[PDB]
């Protein structure tokens, strides 16, 4: 905000959305994929007891 | 659709300050171009009247 | 098309390009997760059939 103006500094702001969008993507992916990791687990915890 | 006309005579020494975004002393006390706004400006010298 | 010549709505073709491939990398990566999670279901009711 105090660094550049709207016009200009909108391509940086750009680059600030696309890496943080990407980074909640991959952390989302890895989240699920250990839920879905315990799943299984869960699903044989459940069958032991 | 609606097309608007705005038209004066300025010195050359601000032609080149008349744009949608920046500052000046003619673009930020004597008009408003909207950054959103979509245009076409035309200068042309005028010495014979 | 009619909004730019090709060569400045380039850079806005490629941002139309990156936002639609990553919502396909998205989306299909959410659809091999639900694969995946029907995928143990599906043994579990073959095991119970």
């Given at each position: 905000l105090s660094r550049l103006d709207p016009p200009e500094a909108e391509v940086?702001?750009?680059?600030?959305i696309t890496g943080?969008?990407?980074?909640?993507?991959?952390?989302?992916?890895?989240?699920?994929?250990?839920?879905?990791?315990?799943?299984?687990?869960?699903?044989?915890?459940?069958?032991?007891m | 659709t609606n097309v608007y006309a705005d038209s004066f005579v300025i010195r050359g020494d601000?032609?080149?300050?008349?744009?949608?975004?920046?500052?000046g002393k003619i673009a930020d006390y004597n008009y408003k171009l909207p950054d959103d706004f979509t245009g076409?400006?035309?200068?042309?010298?005028?010495?014979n009247l």
């Open positions: 940086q702001i750009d680059r600030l943080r969008l990407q980074s909640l993507q991959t952390y989302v992916t890895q989240q699920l994929i250990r839920a879905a990791e315990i799943r299984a687990s869960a699903n044989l915890a459940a069958t032991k | 601000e032609v080149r300050q008349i744009a949608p975004g920046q500052t076409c400006v035309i200068a042309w010298n005028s010495n």
